[PDB]
UniProtKB/Swiss-Prot annotation, chain A:
The SANT domains may bridge the nucleosomal substrates and the demethylase KDM1A. Transmembrane segments: none annotated. Interacts directly with GFI1 and GFI1B in a RCOR/GFI/KDM1A/HDAC complex. Interacts with INMS1. Component of a BHC histone deacetylase complex that contains HDAC1, HDAC2, HMG20B/BRAF35, KDM1A, RCOR1/CoREST and PHF21A/BHC80. The BHC complex may also contain ZMYM2, ZNF217, ZMYM3, GSE1 and GTF2I. Interacts with REST. Interacts with the SMARCE1/BAF57, suggesting that the BHC complex may recruit the ATP-dependent chromatin-remodeling SWI-SNF complex. Interacts with SOX2. Residues 71-122 form the SANT domain. Belongs to the CoREST family. The chain holds residues 311 to 443 of 485 of the full protein. Phosphorylated by HSV-1 protein kinases in case of infection. It comes from Homo sapiens. Essential component of the BHC complex, a corepressor complex that represses transcription of neuron-specific genes in non-neuronal cells. The BHC complex is recruited at RE1/NRSE sites by REST and acts by deacetylating and demethylating specific sites on histones, thereby acting as a chromatin modifier. In the BHC complex, it serves as a molecular beacon for the recruitment of molecular machinery, including MeCP2 and SUV39H1, that imposes silencing across a chromosomal interval. Residues 1-74 are annotated as: Interaction with KDM1A. Residues 24-59 form a coiled coil. Ubiquitously expressed. This is REST corepressor 1.
Curated annotation (Swiss-Prot), chain B:
The N-terminal sequences of INSM1 and SNAI1 compete with histone H3 for the same binding site and thereby inhibit histone demethylation (in vitro). The chain holds residues 171 to 836 of 852 of the full protein. This is Lysine-specific histone demethylase 1A. The keyword Acetylation applies. It comes from Homo sapiens. Residues 130-666 are annotated as: Demethylase activity. There is a cross-link at K272, K299 (Glycyl lysine isopeptide (Lys-Gly) (interchain with G-Cter in SUMO2)). FAD binds at S119, E138, R140, R146, M162, V163, E631, T640, V641. The modification N6-acetyllysine is found at K262, K263, K266. Acetylated by KAT8 in epithelial but not in mesenchymal cells, thereby regulating the epithelial-to-mesenchymal transition. Acetylation by KAT8 reduces KDM1A association with nucleosomes, thereby decreasing histone H3 demethylation, leading to transcription activatio of target genes. It catalyses: N(6),N(6)-dimethyl-L-lysyl(4)-[histone H3] + 2 A + 2 H2O = L-lysyl(4)-[histone H3] + 2 formaldehyde + 2 AH2. The gene is KDM1A. It is an enzyme of class 1 (oxidoreductase).
Length: 133, 666
């Protein structure tokens, strides 16, 4: 019903290796060259990646900023309201970004701000100008 | 098996079923009620048991009926019919036994048997037992034919048949009780030794053998499951198929490597795209940090836009730093996945040069068993006689196999040195024209009712013929002769003064240097009481080594043995003999094999008797005159002694039926 274990023999393969006098040597050479081809292709991309790794040396260490640890506040200082309006102008609806810019306002408080100070800070107009870019 | 059922097995018969032959002689019983069949079968099996329990004395009908019980001994004609059938076809009272009823005073019919090999001798004894006039014509100065035994002093070594291939259902088991045969079991273990002269480690000595067995199963799969049996009109050989299987196993090895390195490039190219994204991000982070720095240099107090810039760029920087860290995360995963794949590559090669040479020994061993290059064997049929193999350990005849034919030859009219030149067969009878081998001009004529031809297939193949048939053998017979394979294997007898090998090791291999010479002195036997080593020449090497003198052959033998046991532990041989079976004019080879383009059906064709045309036109259909026995005529047991023996028994039964009449069929 099926070939022995560790033995590989398909109807397709038999016909291909018995097609002529040296169809056996031909098929085995096409794979011998295919192997050499792929082997030197490996060292090539290995070389390319080795150079790209060296250009990443040091990582992003001299570019990391220390962690700002501030507690979330409920009241809006005029300052924070003004930061918010500018954050909307730059980020639109990315409430997470806006929250991070202000620093001491939670993502929900940011969404609340959108409805509370909606008319007073023409947030409709501010948002439509963000989309204009 | 044991009892009455074991006797059926020991006679190669199904204990609980009637054979085709039995159906022919007893058509009343087999077509009858099931109860009668079982009575028949028991009678048959019990009679066989009686003969088998004591094969040194004739088993008569009277003695048989005596030991039968009710309700089996009630029908005395049924018992007489069964006994007669078994005696006629040589299932009981065959070989060498003491006769209770001394042979009939006058004989009936005359048979000339060509050749006093085992097949010839077996028939001769039977026909004489049936009361026929029998004369055997042997070309050699000895009986046995391809059962040749070298004897000198105490050295005894078979140049021909050597092995009893298991006693389970072997007619030679019966013969071995009748003849003083010193049967010694063969220890299976065979240590190989490479060209260098050093053993193959059990590690490889199993990897190769298991691969060899796997390669055979694979050819069997190629034949039966993929129907790969004809290629370019030519029938596919075992060799061709083995080559194809090996090539596909080398192909798979490469296919595996290709798709493994193909896994590496796909992952390495994923890394390439990730490192590019990382370099471009570290670039933007570099610039963005500078911008944040410059925004922080603007010291307070600052307006809200300037304060926003600082905060905004701070957010943007940690956001891009979030990405780079998640990209360095992925880099670590891909970077170790590459050390994963590079750590475990697939197989480098299918078989190395060292491997392929040890495999070639296994191929040579198979070429030895079939006495022919694997490229000559039929893929579909080379092993058609596997199902009929005997049970039990293979044995050797320690006192020389010739003891068997010589024992059979006793009390028989044998003309030695008598080379048959022509066989003439007509509606009225036969004349055989032979000459004296010593002075070829001295001619003999033999007139007979029937001729039993036991000429080897090698002989029958000769072109131009060594034996002429008048009239010529029919096209269906000669085509079978041409189609069938007649192979070759040779032996080198090496007689020493001392044992320098492992005495508990029966056989040990020598691995050749090339595929071309794998057969050349590949195996050595240590079987005899005396210090004798026997060297085999198989495969393509057998035919070539025959053109080389004994000294050179013995030279190469010593060389090989030196490499294995030490250059000073191997002395000069006192006596040496080299067989040349293909050269031998009375053999022209060693034994038959199922050639590519042949089948087991050709063996049946070989066994078919020839019936001459009528003398006077319009005269009734003549009796068959020319019968064939021998190794190459028995489909289920070809190329063996027991096969030859059995074919003899077969023909003797057929001839006696023809010329003495079958009284038991009523
Ligand atoms: C399966 C096997 N392969 C069995 C063997 C085996 C091998 C490996 C592992 C285990 C066992 C195995 N080994 C083994 C080795 C070698 C080296 C050879 C050679 C053969 C065998 N065989 C096969 C058997 O040896 C083989 O099958 C039988 O012995 C053959 O018996 P006939 O059928 O009767 O043929 P023949 O004896 O020729 O009688 C014909 C006579 O006619 C004469 N004549 C000629 N011309 C004439 C003329 N013009 N006018 C007048 N006369 C003329 C001519 O001179 C001759 O006397 C073995 N048979 C076994 O049972 N066991 C063995 O071990």
């Amino acid at each position: 019903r099926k070939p022995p274990k560790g033995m590989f023999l398909s109807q397709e393969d038999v016909e291909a290796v018995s097609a002529n006098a040296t169809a056996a040597t031909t098929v085995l050479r096409q794979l011998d060259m295919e192997l050499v081809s792929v082997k030197r292709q490996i060292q090539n991309i290995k070389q390319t990646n080795s150079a790209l790794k060296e250009k990443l040396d040091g990582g992003i260490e001299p570019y990391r900023l220390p962690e700002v640890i501030q507690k979330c506040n409920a009241r809006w200082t005029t300052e924070e309201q003004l930061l918010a309006v500018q954050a909307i102008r730059k980020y639109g609806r990315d409430f997470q970004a806006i929250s991070d810019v202000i620093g001491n306002k939670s993502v929900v408080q940011v969404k609340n701000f959108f409805v509370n100070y909606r008319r007073r800070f023409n947030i409709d107009e501010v948002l439509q100008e963000w989309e204009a870019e | 098996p044991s009892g009455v059922e074991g006797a059926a097995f020991q006679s190669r018969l199904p204990h609980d079923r009637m054979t085709s032959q039995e159906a022919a002689c007893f058509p009343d019983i087999i077509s009858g009620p099931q109860q009668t069949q079982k009575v028949f079968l028991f009678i048959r099996n019990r009679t066989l048991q009686l003969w088998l329990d004591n094969p040194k004395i004739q088993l008569t009908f009277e003695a048989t009926l005596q030991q039968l019980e009710a309700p089996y001994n009630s029908d005395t004609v049924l018992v007489h019919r069964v006994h007669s059938y078994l005696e006629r076809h040589g299932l009981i009272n065959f070989g060498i036994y003491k006769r209770i009823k001394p042979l009939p005073t006058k004989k009936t019919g005359k048979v000339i048997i060509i050749g006093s090999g085992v097949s010839g001798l077996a028939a001769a004894r039977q026909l004489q037992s049936f009361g026929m006039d029998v004369t055997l014509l042997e070309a050699r100065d000895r009986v046995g034919g391809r059962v040749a035994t070298f004897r000198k002093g105490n050295y005894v070594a078979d140049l021909g048949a050597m092995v009893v291939t298991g006693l389970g259902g072997n007619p030679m088991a019966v013969v071995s009780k009748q003849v003083n045969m010193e049967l010694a079991k063969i220890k299976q273990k065979c240590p190989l030794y490479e060209a260098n002269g050093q053993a193959v480690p059990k590690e490889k000595d199993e990897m190769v053998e298991q691969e060899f067995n796997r390669l055979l199963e694979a050819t069997s799969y190629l034949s039966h499951q993929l129907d790969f049996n004809v290629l370019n009109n030519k029938p596919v050989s075992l060799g061709q198929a083995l080559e194809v299987v090996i090539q596909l196993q080398e192909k798979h090895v490469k296919d595996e490597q290709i798709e493994h390195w193909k896994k590496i490039v796909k992952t390495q190219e994923e890394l390439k795209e990730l490192l590019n994204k990382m370099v471009n991000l570290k670039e933007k982070i570099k610039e963005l940090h500078q911008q944040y720095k410059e925004a922080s240099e603007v010291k307070p107090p600052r307006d809200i836009t300037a304060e926003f810039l600082v905060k905004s760029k701070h957010r943007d920087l940690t956001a891009l730093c979030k990405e780079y860290d998640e990209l360095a995360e992925t880099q670590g995963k891909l970077e170790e996945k590459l050390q994963e794949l590079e750590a475990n590559p697939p197989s480098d090669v299918y078989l190395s040069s060292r491997d392929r040479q040890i495999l070639d020994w296994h191929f040579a061993n198979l070429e030895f068993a079939n006495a022919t290059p694997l490229s000559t064997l039929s893929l579909k049929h080379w092993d058609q006689d596997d199902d009929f193999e005997f049970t039990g350990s293979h044995l050797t005849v320690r006192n020389g196999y010739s003891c068997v034919p010589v024992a059979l030859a006793e009390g028989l009219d044998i003309k030695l040195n008598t080379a048959v030149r022509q066989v003439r067969y007509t509606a009225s009878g036969c004349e055989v024209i032979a000459v004296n081998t010593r002075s070829t001009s001295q001619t003999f004529i033999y007139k007979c009712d029937a001729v039993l031809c036991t000429l080897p297939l090698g002989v029958l193949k000769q072109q131009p013929p060594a034996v002429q048939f008048v009239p010529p053998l029919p096209e269906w017979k000669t085509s079978a002769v041409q189609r069938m394979g007649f192979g070759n294997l040779n032996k080198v007898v090496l007689c020493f003064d001392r044992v320098f090998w492992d005495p508990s090791v029966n056989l040990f291999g020598h691995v050749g240097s090339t595929t071309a010479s794998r057969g050349e002195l590949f195996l050595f036997w240590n079987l005899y009481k005396a210090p004798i080593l026997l060297a085999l020449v198989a495969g393509e090497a057998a035919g070539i080594m025959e053109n080389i003198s004994d000294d050179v052959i013995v030279g190469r033998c010593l060389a090989i043995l030196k490499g294995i046991f030490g250059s000073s532990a191997v002395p000069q041989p006192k006596e040496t003999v080299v067989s040349r079976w293909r050269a031998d004019p009375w053999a022209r080879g060693s034994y038959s094999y199922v050639a590519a383009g042949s089948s087991g059906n050709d063996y049946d064709l070989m066994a078919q008797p020839i019936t001459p045309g009528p003398s006077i036109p319009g005269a009734p259909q003549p009796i068959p005159r020319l019968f064939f026995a021998g190794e190459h005529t028995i489909r289920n047991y070809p190329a063996t002694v027991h096969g030859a023996l059995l074919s003899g028994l077969r023909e003797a039964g057929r001839i006696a039926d023809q010329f003495l009449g079958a009284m038991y069929t009523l």
